[PDB]
């Protein structure tokens, strides 16, 4: 389609289904998820969102990203910090895993930010809009399954306190995405990078699932 | 005493006891606290920490604050945002109170930041170190009392995920405070401002208590 947002949606439909039908995620959806499992994804999200947001900050003033820069509304690093402190204790920093699939994702994010900032929007879209749209569904699953203490922390990641309405925000985001001017060369690269992002996720889930069964 | 940290501790002992004597806080300590009550302090903390951190950012490079600037370790705005979203729902932004005692506190903070940045450390000390040292306790009280859902959010404020050890951090903070070079003129102004900060708190508790009994 003409609009980037639509083109991304449709171009990635295959990999997104593959991504949502990864075993780990399938079991997540069906309600089967363990504490160790949850601790792992949260640790992954941290590494990922640290890298992503590091590179967003690097390129926030560039024309190729500035229009989709919404720091207050989207930033996840902090909430992840809050959550990991809960899940892993005060020395979470030192004791959280950093598996090869996490490195591979972190690595790509940095190579994009440093040398292809024009593609960064692919990852921003993939992650933020994804987690926004599939958050609140995951979240509910997690609390029923993980049978948590009434300690009032652990799931901050699944709430974007500065976005009153998701639907309004998604539209505004898409609008801004589609405002981005780019050559057809770049546009296809961006579409591919989005597929890449889904794969990096897919392989990460395969990796986590492998670890959890051993 | 010679060291600012000690001079502040001893100079404010009266007001601090008065502050911890306040009915609202007394009832908090002895376990008696309601949802409406809790929602109110959390809303206050938001307004306060927004103003404080706004002014910290304004003056972080100044000699009169830079040495006690620990953004990652201390910042509370975000966690408060997470918590209010939980306590007040997605439109917390629009529906949280902003009473006169909150305005009075917010007002002072901005007056200090804009025209007496040298005193800002009084408020930083009062708030951050206070909440740090009294946190894990108020947290526990709050969860037993408020009987909250296992929803994994609501109490992020009471956790500083980037401070592995409180005791180590308090020392480092005090060290930095005491490093700050200032004239005796300023030093007394700072000591007074700290007393001010405690009062602003005291009056706020009196105000909240008044509201809660109608
Ligand atoms: C159990 C896991 C997941 C669930 C239950 C889930 C659920 C959903 C739901 C219900 C939507 C709404 C469809 C729409 O309005 O477009 C959605 C959209 C989306 N999800 Fe997921 N999702 C999951 C995992 C993922 C993952 C892992 C990613 C990416 C790494 C992702 C990326 C997206 C994106 C980008 C959209 C928006 C598509 C668009 O409108 O452009 N999701 N998700
Ligand atoms: C509301 C305003 C309050 C402020 C501004 C405040 C401030 C402070 C400060 C600045 C310190 C120690 C810093 C120093 O060494 O001088 C402190 C210590 C402490 N506060 Fe509070 N506080 C407040 C309320 C409370 C409440 C309600 C409790 C309830 C249990 C509490 C419990 C403590 C405890 C246990 C300490 C001991 C830490 C220590 O001295 O080793 N505080 N407070």
Curated annotation (Swiss-Prot), chains A, B:
Its EC number is 1.14.14.18. Induction: Heme oxygenase 1 activity is highly inducible by its substrate heme and by various non-heme substances such as heavy metals, bromobenzene, endotoxin, oxidizing agents and UVA. The record marks 131 as: Important for catalytic activity. It is a single-pass type IV membrane protein. It catalyses: heme b + 3 reduced [NADPH--hemoprotein reductase] + 3 O2 = biliverdin IXalpha + CO + Fe(2+) + 3 oxidized [NADPH--hemoprotein reductase] + 3 H2O + H(+). It is found in: Endoplasmic reticulum membrane. It is an enzyme of class 1 (oxidoreductase). GO terms for molecular function: enzyme binding; heme binding; heme oxygenase (decyclizing) activity; identical protein binding; metal ion binding; protein homodimerization activity; structural molecule activity. Heme b binds at residues 9, 16, 125, 174. Its main location: endoplasmic reticulum. Keywords: Apoptosis, Endoplasmic reticulum, Heme, Host-virus interaction, Iron, Membrane, Metal-binding, Oxidoreductase, Phosphoprotein, Transmembrane, Transmembrane helix. Residues 1-214 are cytoplasmic. A soluble form arises by proteolytic removal of the membrane anchor. One of its GO terms (biological process) is cellular response to cisplatin. Expressed at higher levels in renal cancer tissue than in normal tissue (at protein level). The transmembrane domain is necessary for its oligomerization. (Microbial infection) Interacts with SARS-CoV-2 ORF3A protein; the interaction promotes ORF3A-induced autophagy but is unlikely to be involved in ORF3A-mediated induction of reticulophagy. Homodimer and higher order homooligomer. Oligomerization is crucial for its stability and function in the endoplasmic reticulum. Interacts with FLVCR2; this interaction is potentiated in the presence of heme. Belongs to the heme oxygenase family. It is linked to Heme oxygenase 1 deficiency: A disease characterized by impaired stress hematopoiesis, resulting in marked erythrocyte fragmentation and intravascular hemolysis, coagulation abnormalities, endothelial damage, and iron deposition in renal and hepatic tissues. Clinical features include persistent hemolytic anemia, asplenia, nephritis, generalized erythematous rash, growth retardation and hepatomegaly. This is Heme oxygenase 1. It comes from Homo sapiens. The lineage of its organism: Eukaryota, Metazoa, Chordata, Craniata, Vertebrata. The chain holds residues 10 to 223 of 288 of the full protein.
